[PDB]
JSON list of C-alpha atoms in Angstrom, two decimals:
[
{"chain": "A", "resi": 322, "resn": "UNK", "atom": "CA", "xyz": [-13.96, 60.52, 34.37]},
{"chain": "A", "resi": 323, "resn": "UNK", "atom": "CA", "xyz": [-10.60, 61.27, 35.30]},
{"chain": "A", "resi": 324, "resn": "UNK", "atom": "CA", "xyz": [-8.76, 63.35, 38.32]},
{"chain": "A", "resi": 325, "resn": "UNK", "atom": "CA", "xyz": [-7.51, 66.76, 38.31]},
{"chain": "A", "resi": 326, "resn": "UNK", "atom": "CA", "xyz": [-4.03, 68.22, 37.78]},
{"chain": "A", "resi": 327, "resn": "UNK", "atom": "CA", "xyz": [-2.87, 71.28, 39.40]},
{"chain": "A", "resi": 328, "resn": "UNK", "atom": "CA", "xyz": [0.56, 73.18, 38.14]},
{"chain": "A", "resi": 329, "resn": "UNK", "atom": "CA", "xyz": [1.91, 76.20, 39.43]},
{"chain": "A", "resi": 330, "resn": "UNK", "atom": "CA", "xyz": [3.66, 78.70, 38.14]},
{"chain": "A", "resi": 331, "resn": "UNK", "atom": "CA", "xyz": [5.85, 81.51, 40.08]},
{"chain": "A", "resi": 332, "resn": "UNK", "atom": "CA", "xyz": [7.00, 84.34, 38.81]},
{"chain": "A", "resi": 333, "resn": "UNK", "atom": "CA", "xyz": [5.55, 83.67, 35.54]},
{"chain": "A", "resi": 334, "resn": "UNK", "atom": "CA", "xyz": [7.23, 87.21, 34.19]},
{"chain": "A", "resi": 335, "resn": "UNK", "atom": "CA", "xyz": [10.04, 85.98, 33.85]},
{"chain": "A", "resi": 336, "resn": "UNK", "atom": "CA", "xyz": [9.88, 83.25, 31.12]},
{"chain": "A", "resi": 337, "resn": "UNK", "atom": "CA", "xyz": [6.59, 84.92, 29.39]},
{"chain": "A", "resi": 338, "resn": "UNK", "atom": "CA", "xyz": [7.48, 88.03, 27.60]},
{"chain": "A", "resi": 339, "resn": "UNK", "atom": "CA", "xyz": [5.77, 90.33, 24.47]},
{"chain": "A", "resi": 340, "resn": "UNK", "atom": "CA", "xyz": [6.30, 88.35, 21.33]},
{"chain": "A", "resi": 341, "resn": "UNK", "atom": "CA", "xyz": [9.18, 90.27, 19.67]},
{"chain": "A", "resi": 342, "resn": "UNK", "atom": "CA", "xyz": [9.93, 92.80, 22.98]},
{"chain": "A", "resi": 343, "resn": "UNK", "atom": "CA", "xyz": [13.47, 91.50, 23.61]},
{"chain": "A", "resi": 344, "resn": "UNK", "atom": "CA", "xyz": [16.15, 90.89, 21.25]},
{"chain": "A", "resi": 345, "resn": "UNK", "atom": "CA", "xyz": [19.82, 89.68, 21.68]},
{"chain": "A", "resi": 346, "resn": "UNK", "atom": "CA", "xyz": [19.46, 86.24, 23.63]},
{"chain": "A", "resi": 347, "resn": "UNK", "atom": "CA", "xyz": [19.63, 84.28, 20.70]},
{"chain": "A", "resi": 348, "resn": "UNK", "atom": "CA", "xyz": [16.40, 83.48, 20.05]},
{"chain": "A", "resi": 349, "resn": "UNK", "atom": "CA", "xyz": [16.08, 81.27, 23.65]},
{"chain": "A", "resi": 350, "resn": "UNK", "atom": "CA", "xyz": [12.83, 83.43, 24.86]},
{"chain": "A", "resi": 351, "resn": "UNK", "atom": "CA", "xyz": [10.57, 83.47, 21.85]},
{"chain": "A", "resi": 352, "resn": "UNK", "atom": "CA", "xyz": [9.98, 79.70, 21.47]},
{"chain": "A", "resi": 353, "resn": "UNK", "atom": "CA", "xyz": [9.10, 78.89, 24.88]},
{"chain": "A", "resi": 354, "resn": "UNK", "atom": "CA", "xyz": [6.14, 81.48, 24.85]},
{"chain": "A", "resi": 355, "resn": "UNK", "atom": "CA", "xyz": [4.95, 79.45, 21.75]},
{"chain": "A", "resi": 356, "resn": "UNK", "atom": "CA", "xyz": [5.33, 76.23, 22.92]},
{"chain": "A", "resi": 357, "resn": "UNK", "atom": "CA", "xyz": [3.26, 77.50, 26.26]},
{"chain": "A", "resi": 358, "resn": "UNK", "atom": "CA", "xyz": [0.65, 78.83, 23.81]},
{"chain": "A", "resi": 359, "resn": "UNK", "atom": "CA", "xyz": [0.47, 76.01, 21.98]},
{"chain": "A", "resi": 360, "resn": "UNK", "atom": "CA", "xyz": [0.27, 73.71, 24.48]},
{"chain": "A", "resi": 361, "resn": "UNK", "atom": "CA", "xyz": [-2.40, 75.53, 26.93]},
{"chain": "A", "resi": 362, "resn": "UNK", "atom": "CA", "xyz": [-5.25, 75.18, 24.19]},
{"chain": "A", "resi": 363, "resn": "UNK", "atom": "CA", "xyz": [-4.08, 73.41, 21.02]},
{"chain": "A", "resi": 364, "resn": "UNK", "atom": "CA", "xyz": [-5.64, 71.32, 18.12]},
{"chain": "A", "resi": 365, "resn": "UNK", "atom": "CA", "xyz": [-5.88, 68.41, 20.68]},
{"chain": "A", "resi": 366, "resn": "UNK", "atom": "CA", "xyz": [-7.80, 69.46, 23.88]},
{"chain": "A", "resi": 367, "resn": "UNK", "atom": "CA", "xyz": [-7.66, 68.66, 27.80]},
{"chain": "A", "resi": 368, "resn": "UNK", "atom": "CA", "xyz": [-10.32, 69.40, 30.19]},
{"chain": "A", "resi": 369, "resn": "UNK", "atom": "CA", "xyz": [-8.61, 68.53, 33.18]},
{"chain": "A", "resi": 370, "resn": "UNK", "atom": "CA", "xyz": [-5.86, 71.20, 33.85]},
{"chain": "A", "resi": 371, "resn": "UNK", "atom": "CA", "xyz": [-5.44, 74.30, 36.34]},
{"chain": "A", "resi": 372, "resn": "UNK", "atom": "CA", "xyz": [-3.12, 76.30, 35.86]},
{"chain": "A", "resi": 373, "resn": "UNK", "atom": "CA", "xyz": [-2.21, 79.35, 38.44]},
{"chain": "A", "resi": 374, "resn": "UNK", "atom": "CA", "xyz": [0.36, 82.23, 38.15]},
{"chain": "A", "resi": 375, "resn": "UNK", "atom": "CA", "xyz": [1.61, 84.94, 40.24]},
{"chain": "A", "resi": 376, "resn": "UNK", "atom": "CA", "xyz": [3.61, 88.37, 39.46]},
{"chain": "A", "resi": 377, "resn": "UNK", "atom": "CA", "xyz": [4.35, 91.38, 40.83]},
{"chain": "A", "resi": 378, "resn": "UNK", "atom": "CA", "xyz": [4.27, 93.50, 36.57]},
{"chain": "A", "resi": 379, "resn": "UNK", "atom": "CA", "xyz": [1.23, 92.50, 35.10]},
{"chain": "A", "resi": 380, "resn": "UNK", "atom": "CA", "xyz": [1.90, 94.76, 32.23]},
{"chain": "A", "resi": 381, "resn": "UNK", "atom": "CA", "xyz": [4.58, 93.11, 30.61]},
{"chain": "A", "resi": 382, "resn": "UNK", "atom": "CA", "xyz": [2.82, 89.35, 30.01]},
{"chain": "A", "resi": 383, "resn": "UNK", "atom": "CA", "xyz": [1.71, 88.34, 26.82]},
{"chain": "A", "resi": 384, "resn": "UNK", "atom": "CA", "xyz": [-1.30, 89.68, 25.76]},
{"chain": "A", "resi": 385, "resn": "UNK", "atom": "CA", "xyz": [-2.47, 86.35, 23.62]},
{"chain": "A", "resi": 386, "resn": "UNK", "atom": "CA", "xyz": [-1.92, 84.81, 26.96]},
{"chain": "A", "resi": 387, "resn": "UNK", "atom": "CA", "xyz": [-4.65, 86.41, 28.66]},
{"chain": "A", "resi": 388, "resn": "UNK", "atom": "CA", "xyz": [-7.84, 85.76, 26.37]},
{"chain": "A", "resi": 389, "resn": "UNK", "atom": "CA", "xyz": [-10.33, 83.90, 27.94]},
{"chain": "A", "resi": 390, "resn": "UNK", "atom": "CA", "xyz": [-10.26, 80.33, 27.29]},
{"chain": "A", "resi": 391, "resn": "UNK", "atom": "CA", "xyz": [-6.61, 80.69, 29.09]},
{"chain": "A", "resi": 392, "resn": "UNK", "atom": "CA", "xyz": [-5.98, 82.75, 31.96]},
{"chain": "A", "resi": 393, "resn": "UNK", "atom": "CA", "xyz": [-9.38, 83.81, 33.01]},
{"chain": "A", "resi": 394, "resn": "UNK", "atom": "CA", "xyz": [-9.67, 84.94, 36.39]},
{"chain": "A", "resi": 395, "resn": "UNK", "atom": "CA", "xyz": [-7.45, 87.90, 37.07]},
{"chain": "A", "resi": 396, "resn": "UNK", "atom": "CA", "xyz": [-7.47, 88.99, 40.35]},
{"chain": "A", "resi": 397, "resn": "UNK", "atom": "CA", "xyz": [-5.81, 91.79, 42.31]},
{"chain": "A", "resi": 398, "resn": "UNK", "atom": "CA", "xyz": [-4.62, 91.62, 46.37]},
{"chain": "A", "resi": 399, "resn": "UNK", "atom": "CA", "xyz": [-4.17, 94.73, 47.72]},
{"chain": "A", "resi": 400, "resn": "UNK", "atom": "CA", "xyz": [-3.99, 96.77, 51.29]},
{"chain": "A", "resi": 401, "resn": "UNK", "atom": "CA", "xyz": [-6.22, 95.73, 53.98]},
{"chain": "A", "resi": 402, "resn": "UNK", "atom": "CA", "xyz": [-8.34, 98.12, 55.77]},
{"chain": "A", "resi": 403, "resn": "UNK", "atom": "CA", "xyz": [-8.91, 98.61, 59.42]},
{"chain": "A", "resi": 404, "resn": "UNK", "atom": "CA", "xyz": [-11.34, 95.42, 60.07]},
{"chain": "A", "resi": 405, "resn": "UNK", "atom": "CA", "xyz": [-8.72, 93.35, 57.64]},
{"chain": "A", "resi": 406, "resn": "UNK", "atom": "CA", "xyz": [-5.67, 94.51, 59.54]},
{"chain": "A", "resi": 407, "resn": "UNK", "atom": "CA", "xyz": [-7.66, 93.43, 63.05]},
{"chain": "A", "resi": 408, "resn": "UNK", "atom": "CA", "xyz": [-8.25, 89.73, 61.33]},
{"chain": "A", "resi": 409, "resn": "UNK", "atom": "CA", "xyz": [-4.78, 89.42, 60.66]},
{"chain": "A", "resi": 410, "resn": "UNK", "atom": "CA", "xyz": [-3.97, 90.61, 64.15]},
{"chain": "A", "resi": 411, "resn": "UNK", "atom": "CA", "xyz": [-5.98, 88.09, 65.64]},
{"chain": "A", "resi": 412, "resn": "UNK", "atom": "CA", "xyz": [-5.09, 85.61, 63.62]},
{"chain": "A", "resi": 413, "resn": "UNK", "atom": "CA", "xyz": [-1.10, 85.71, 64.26]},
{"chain": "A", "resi": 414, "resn": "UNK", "atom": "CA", "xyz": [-1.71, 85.56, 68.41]},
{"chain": "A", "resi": 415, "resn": "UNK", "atom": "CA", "xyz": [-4.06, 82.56, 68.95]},
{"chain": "A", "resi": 416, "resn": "UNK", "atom": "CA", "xyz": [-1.27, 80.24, 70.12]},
{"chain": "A", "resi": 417, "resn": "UNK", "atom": "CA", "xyz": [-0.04, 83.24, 72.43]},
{"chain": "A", "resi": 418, "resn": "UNK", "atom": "CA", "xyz": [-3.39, 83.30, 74.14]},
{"chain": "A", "resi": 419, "resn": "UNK", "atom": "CA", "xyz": [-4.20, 79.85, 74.01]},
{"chain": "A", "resi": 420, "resn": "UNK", "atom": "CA", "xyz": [-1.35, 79.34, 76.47]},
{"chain": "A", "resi": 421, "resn": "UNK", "atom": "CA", "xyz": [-1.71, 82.42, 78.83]},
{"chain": "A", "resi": 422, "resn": "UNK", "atom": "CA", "xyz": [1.27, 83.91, 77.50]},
{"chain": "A", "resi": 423, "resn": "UNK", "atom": "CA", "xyz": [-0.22, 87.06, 76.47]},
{"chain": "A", "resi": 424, "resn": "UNK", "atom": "CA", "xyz": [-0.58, 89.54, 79.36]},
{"chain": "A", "resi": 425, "resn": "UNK", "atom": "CA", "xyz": [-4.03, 91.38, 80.05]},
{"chain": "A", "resi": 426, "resn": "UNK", "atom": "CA", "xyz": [-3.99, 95.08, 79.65]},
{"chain": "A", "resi": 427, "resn": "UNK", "atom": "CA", "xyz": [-3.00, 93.69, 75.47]},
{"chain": "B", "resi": 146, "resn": "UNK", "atom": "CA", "xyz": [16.43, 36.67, 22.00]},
{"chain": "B", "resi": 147, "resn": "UNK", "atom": "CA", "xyz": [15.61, 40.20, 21.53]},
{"chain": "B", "resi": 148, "resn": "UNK", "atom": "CA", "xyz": [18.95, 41.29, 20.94]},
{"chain": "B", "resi": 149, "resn": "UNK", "atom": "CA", "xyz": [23.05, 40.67, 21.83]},
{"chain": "B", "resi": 150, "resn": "UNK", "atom": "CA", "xyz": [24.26, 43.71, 21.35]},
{"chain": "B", "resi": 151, "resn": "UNK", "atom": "CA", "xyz": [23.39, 47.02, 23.24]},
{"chain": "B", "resi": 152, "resn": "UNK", "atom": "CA", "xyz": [22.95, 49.72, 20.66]},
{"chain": "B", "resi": 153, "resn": "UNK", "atom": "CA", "xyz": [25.25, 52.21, 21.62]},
{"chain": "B", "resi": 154, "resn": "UNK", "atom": "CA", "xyz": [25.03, 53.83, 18.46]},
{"chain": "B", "resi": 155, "resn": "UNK", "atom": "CA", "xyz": [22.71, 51.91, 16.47]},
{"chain": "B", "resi": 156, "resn": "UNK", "atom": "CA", "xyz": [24.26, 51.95, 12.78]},
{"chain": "B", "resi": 157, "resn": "UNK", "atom": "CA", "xyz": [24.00, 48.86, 10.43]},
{"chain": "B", "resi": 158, "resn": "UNK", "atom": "CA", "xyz": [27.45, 47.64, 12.08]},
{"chain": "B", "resi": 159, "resn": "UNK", "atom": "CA", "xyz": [25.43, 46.59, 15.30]},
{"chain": "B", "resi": 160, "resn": "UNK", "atom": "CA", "xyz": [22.67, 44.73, 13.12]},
{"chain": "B", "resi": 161, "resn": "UNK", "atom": "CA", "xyz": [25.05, 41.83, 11.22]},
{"chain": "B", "resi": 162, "resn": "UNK", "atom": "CA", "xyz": [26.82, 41.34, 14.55]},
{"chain": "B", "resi": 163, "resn": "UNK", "atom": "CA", "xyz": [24.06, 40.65, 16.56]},
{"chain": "B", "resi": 164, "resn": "UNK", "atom": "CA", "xyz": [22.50, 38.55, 13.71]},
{"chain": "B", "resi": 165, "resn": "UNK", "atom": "CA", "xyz": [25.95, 36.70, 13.60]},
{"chain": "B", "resi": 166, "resn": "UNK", "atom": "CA", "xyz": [25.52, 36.31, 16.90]},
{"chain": "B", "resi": 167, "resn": "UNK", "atom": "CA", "xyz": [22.23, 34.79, 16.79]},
{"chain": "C", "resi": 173, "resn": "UNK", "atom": "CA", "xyz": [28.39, 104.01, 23.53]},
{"chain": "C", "resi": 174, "resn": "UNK", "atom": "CA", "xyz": [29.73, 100.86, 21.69]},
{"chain": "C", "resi": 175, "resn": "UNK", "atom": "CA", "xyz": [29.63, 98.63, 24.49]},
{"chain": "C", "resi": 176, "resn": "UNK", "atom": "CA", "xyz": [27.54, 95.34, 24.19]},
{"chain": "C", "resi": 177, "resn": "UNK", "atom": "CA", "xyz": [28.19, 91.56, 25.38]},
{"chain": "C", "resi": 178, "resn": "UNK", "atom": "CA", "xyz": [26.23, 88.70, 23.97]},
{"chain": "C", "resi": 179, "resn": "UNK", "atom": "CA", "xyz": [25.76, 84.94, 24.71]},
{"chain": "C", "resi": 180, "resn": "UNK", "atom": "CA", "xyz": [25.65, 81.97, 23.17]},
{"chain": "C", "resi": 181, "resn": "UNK", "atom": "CA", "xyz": [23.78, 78.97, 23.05]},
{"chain": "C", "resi": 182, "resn": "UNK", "atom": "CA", "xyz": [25.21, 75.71, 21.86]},
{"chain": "C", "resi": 183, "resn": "UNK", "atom": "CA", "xyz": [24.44, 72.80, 18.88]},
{"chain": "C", "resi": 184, "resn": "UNK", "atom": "CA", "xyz": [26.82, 70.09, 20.25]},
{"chain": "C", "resi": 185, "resn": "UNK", "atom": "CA", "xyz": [26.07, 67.19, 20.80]},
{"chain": "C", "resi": 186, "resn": "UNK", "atom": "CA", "xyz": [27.39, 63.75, 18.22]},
{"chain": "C", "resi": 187, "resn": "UNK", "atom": "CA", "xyz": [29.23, 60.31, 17.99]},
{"chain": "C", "resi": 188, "resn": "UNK", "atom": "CA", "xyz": [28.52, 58.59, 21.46]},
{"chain": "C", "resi": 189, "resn": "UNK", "atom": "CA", "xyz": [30.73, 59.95, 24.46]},
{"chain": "C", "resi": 190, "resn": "UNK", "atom": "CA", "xyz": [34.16, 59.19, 25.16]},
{"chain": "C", "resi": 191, "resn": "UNK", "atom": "CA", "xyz": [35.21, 55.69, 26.11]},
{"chain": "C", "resi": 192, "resn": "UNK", "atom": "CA", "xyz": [33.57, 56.04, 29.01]},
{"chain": "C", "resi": 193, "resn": "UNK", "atom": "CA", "xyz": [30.57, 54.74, 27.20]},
{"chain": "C", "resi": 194, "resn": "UNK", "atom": "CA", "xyz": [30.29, 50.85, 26.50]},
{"chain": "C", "resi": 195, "resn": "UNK", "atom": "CA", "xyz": [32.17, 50.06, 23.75]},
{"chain": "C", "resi": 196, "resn": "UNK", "atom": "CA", "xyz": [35.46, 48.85, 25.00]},
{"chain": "C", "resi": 197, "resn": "UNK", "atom": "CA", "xyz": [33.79, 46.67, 27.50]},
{"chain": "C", "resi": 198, "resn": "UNK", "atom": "CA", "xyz": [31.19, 45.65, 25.18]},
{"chain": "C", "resi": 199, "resn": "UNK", "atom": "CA", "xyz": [34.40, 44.82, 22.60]},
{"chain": "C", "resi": 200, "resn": "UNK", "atom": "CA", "xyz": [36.25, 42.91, 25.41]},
{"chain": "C", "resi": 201, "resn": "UNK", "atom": "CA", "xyz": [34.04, 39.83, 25.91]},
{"chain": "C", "resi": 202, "resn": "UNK", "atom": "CA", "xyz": [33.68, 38.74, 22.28]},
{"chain": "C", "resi": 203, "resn": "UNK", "atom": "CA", "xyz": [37.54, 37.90, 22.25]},
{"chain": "C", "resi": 204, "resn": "UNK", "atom": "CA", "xyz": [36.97, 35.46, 24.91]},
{"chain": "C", "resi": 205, "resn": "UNK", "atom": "CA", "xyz": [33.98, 33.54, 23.26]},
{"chain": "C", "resi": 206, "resn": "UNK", "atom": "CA", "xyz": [35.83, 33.67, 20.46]},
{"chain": "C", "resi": 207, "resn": "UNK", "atom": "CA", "xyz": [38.89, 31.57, 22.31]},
{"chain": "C", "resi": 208, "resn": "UNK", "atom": "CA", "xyz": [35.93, 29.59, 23.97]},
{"chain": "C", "resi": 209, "resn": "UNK", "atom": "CA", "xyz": [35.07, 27.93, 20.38]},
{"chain": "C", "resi": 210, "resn": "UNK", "atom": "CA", "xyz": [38.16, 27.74, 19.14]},
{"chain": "C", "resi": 211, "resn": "UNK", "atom": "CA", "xyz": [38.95, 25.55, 21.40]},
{"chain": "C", "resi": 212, "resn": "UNK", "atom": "CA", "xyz": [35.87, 23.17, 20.73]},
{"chain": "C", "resi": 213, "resn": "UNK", "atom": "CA", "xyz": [36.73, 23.26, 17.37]},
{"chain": "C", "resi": 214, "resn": "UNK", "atom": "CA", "xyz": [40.04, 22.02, 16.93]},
{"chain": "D", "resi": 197, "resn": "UNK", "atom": "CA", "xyz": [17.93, 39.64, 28.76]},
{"chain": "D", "resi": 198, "resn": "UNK", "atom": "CA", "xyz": [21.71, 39.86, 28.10]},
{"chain": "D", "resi": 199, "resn": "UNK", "atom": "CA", "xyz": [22.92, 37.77, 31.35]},
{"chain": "D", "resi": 200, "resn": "UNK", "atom": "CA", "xyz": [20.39, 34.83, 30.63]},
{"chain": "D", "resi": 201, "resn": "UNK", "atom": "CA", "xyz": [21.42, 34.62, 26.94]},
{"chain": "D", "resi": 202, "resn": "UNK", "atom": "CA", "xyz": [24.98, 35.03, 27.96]},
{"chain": "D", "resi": 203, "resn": "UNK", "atom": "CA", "xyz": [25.45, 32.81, 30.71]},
{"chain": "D", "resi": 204, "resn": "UNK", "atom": "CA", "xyz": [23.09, 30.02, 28.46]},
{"chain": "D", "resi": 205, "resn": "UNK", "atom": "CA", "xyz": [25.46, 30.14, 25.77]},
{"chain": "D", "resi": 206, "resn": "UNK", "atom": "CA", "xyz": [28.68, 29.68, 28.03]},
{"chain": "D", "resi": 207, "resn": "UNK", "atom": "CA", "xyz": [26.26, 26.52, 30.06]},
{"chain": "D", "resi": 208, "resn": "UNK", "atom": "CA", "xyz": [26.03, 24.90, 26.84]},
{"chain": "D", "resi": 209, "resn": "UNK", "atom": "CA", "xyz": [29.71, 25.73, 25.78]},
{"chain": "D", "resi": 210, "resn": "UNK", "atom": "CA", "xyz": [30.79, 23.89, 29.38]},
{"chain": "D", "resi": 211, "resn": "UNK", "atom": "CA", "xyz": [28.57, 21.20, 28.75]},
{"chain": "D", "resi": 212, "resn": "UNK", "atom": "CA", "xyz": [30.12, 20.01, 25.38]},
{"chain": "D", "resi": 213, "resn": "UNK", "atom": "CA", "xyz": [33.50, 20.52, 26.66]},
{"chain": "D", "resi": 214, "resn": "UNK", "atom": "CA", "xyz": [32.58, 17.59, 29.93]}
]
């Protein structure tokens, strides 16, 4: 019985790399990916984490740090259509029209 | 009382002095 | 070509900061005590 | 815990000298 903790991570590619890819910053970048690792799902285990991430090269992330048991859900947000385009349309002018600031032949 | 001394940088030297202290 | 930087990342840190830290102050009220029961004594 | 042990020790140290 205990609450829930939320972290967020942005731009995750820039700190989580392949194991072994880069080479020349002293050794900085290939400890932090194994601390993250190790820390995510260890020998000791939480049940009470969240943990979200965003980039814009999902190729070049870890592949270990992808499994399930990690980061599960990967989703993709692409172009809207015609009907999505319309929604977002709408959806930036409601003040406008609440106030009678939008003209009529709009 | 805890202590007289803060410990800066530990090391026996801050032990005897605070126990002389005490 | 033969062109490459590099950067480096540093093991420093030892023996407590420059006098800055406590020390000196710490150091500067003993001297006083130590007038303090001299005095009783004699 | 340093100004009440401090300031005890220099109460008692005033007291003898009275």
């Amino acid at each position: 019985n205990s609450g829930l903790h939320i972290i967020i991570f942005d731009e995750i590619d820039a700190i989580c790399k392949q194991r072994g890819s880069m080479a020349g910053s002293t050794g900085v970048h290939d400890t932090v990916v194994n601390q993250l690792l190790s820390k995510i799902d260890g020998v000791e285990q939480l049940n009470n984490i969240l943990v979200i991430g965003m980039t814009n090269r999902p190729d070049l992330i870890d592949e270990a740090l992808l499994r399930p048991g990690r980061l599960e859900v990967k989703m993709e947000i692409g172009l809207p259509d015609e009907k999505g385009r319309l929604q977002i349309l709408h959806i930036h002018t409601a003040r406008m029209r609440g106030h009678q600031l939008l003209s009529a032949d709009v | 009382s805890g202590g007289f001394i803060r410990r800066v940088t530990n090391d026996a030297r801050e032990n005897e002095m605070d126990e002389n202290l005490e | 070509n033969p062109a490459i930087f590099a950067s480096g990342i540093i093991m420093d840190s030892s023996i407590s900061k420059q006098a800055l830290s406590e020390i000196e102050t710490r150091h500067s009220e003993i001297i006083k005590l130590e007038n303090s029961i001299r005095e009783l004594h004699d």
